[PDB]
Amino acid sequence: SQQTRVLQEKLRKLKEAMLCMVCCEEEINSTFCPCGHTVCCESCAAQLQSCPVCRSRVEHVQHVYLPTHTSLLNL
Amino acid sequence: SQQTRVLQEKLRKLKEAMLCMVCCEEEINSTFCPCGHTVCCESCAAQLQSCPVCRSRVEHVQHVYLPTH
Ligand SMILES: N[C@H]1CCN(S(=O)(=O)c2ccccc2)C1
Ligand SMILES: N[C@H]1CCN(S(=O)(=O)c2ccccc2)C1
Ligand SMILES: N[C@H]1CCN(S(=O)(=O)c2ccccc2)C1
Ligand SMILES: [Zn+2]
Ligand SMILES: [Zn+2]
Ligand SMILES: [Zn+2]
Ligand SMILES: [Zn+2]
Numbered sequence: 826s827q828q829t830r831v832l833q834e835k836l837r838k839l840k841e842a843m844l845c846m847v848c849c850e851e852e853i854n855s856t857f858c859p860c861g862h863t864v865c866c867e868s869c870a871a872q873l874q875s876c877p878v879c880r881s882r883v884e885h886v887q888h889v890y891l892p893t894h895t896s897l898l899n900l
Numbered sequence: 901s902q903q904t905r906v907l908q909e910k911l912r913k914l915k916e917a918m919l920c921m922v923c924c925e926e927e928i929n930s931t932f933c934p935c936g937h938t939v940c941c942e943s944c945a946a947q948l949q950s951c952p953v954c955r956s957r958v959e960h961v962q963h964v965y966l967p968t969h
Contacts, residue, residue, distance in 0.1 A: 832907035839914055842967045856931060856964050863964040878965075887962055889931055889938040890953075892917040 843893055845869050846877065852896045856887045863889060866898075918968055920944050922952065927969060931962040938964060 845851050851866035857873070860881040865873070870886045894900065920926050926941035937953040945961045 826901055826904060829901060829904045829907060832904060832911060836907060836911055836914070839911075839968065846967070853966070856962060858962060861963045861965050863966050887931060887933060888936045889964065890936050891928070891938050892921070893914065893968075 852894060852899055854889055854891070854894065854899055856889055857881070857883045858885050858887050922948075929964055929966070929969065931964055932956070932958045933960050933962050 843852055845853055845866035846864045847869035848866060851868070853863055853865060855865050855867050855870035856863040857865075857870065857876045860876050860879050860883075862876050862878040864878060867886075867888065873883055875882055890899075918928055920928055920941035921939040922944035923941060926943065928938060928940060930940050930942045930945035931938040932940075932945065932948070932951040932953075935951050935954050935956040937951050939953060940948070942961070942963065945958075949958055950956065951958060
C-alpha cells in the first residue's frame with residue numbers, strides 16, 4: 826500500500842543517517858574528541874586535523890561501538 | 901499489507917537500538933572511555949563506574965553528537 830512506501834522511506838533515511846558524511850559508504854564508528862561530533866568512519870576520520878562540523882581542533886579520535894552497527898567492518 | 905507490518909517491526913527495532921540499554925527511555929548520546937562502548941544516555945552513563953558491556957573501568961564519559969539524534 827501507500828503506507829508501505831512511507832515506511833520504506835523512513836527506514837531508508839534512518840539508515841542513510843548512520844553513514845559517514847565524507848565517503849557516504851561506510852558506517853559512522855569514530856568520534857572527534859573533545860568536541861564529540863560522531864560523523865565519520867575510521868578511514869575518513871584518520872587525517873582530519875579539525876572537526877568538519879564545528880572546526881574545533883581534533884585532539885584524538887575515539888572508536889565507538891554502537892548497537893545499530895550492521896556492516897561487516899563493525900561486526 | 902503484511903509487508904507494512906514487517907516494515908513497522910524493522911523500524912521499531914532500529915529505533916529501540918538507539919535507546920539507552922539501562923533506562924530504555926532516553927537516546928544513546930554518551931561513550932564510556934577508553935573502551936568505546938556507546939550504549940547509554942548521559943544520566944545512566946554518569947552513574948556507572950564500570951562499563952555495563954565489558955566491565956572495564958570508566959576513565960571518563962565522552963558526549964557524542966550523532967546525525968540520527
Ligand atoms: N559491534 C557490537 C559490539 C558491541 N557493540 S555495543 O553497541 O556495545 C552492544 C553491546 C551489547 C549489546 C548490543 C550492542 C555492538
Ligand atoms: N591516555 C588517554 C587517551 C584517551 N583516554 S581516555 O580514556 O579517553 C581519557 C581522556 C581524557 C581524560 C581521561 C581519560 C586516555
Ligand atoms: N546534519 C548533520 C551535520 C552533523 N550533525 S551532528 O554532528 O551529527 C549533530 C548531532 C546532534 C546535534 C547536533 C549536531 C548532523
Ligand atoms: Zn568515510
Ligand atoms: Zn565538532
Ligand atoms: Zn539511560
Ligand atoms: Zn566497555
